């Protein structure tokens, strides 16, 4: 199949910025490339078809170009409603295919996370399970790493992570990491620690507790 590769995967920009996104096709598709915009929860919307044709009702600040294998979407001056995920799609030959999408997010200054660790509550332990929670609050950029250690032993396959969307007022992210243990495995160890790596921190920050103290 014709694979479409979009680059970069994410763009960081502010209102008024000029932004360009690219779509590379693995075989030639002449001019039959379309671009869509999609906001979370919502259906995609057509912006441009046949590489450069503006869809009626879409503003001319969106413009597409290219032919053959290399295509570009350009937003001349970003508006607040433009923050979204963008997809390219070729309609030249079956099967129809889409690029993997480019996320356009809001740029701001670097902000380190405030880190918090929560032991399992007594209410949860009474119920037979144990969840340790580590909170990374109000940080930018998005990239962040959380490492769990139990009595200085690195944990793996043991945790799940979740990240909010960009906060509507300060454009930060927050992240939660939950370590799930059985209550009996939890009572086998003393020190539980969350270790956080992020560009806003010159060295990793650890938050820890001793079970039961």
């Amino acid at each position: 199949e014709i694979v479409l590769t979009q680059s970069p995967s994410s763009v960081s920009a502010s209102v008024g910025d000029r932004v360009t996104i690219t779509c590379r096709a693995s075989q030639g598709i002449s001019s039959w490339l379309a671009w869509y915009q999609q906001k979370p929860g919502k259906a995609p919307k057509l912006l441009i078809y046949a590489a450069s044709s503006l869809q009626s009702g879409v503003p001319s600040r969106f413009s597409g170009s290219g032919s053959g294998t290399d295509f570009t979407l350009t937003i001349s001056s970003l508006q607040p409603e433009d923050f979204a995920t963008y997809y390219c799609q070729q309609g030249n030959s079956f099967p129809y295919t889409f690029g993997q999408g480019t996320n356009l997010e809001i740029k701001r200054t670097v902000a380190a996370p405030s880190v918090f660790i929560f032991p399992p509550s007594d209410e949860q332990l009474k119920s037979g399970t144990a969840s340790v929670v580590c909170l990374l609050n109000n940080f930018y950029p998005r990239e962040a790493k959380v490492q769990w250690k139990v009595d200085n032993a690195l944990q793996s396959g043991n945790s799940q992570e979740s990240v909010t969307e960009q906060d509507s007022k300060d454009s930060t992210y927050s992240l939660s990491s939950t370590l799930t243990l059985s209550k009996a495995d939890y009572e086998k160890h003393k020190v539980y620690a969350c270790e956080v790596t992020h560009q806003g921190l010159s060295s990793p920050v650890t938050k820890s507790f001793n079970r039961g103290e």
Partner: peptide
């Protein structure tokens, strides 16, 4: 013929699971 997609429907969400309906337990993060 060459094709593109317009317009799009609002979408139908489909969840397929063995699980059965269950209400959550709510624990404090003190």
């Amino acid at each position: 013929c060459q094709r593109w997609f317009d317009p799009w429907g609002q979408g139908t969400l489909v969840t397929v699971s063995s699980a059965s309906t269950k209400g959550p337990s709510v624990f404090p993060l003190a």
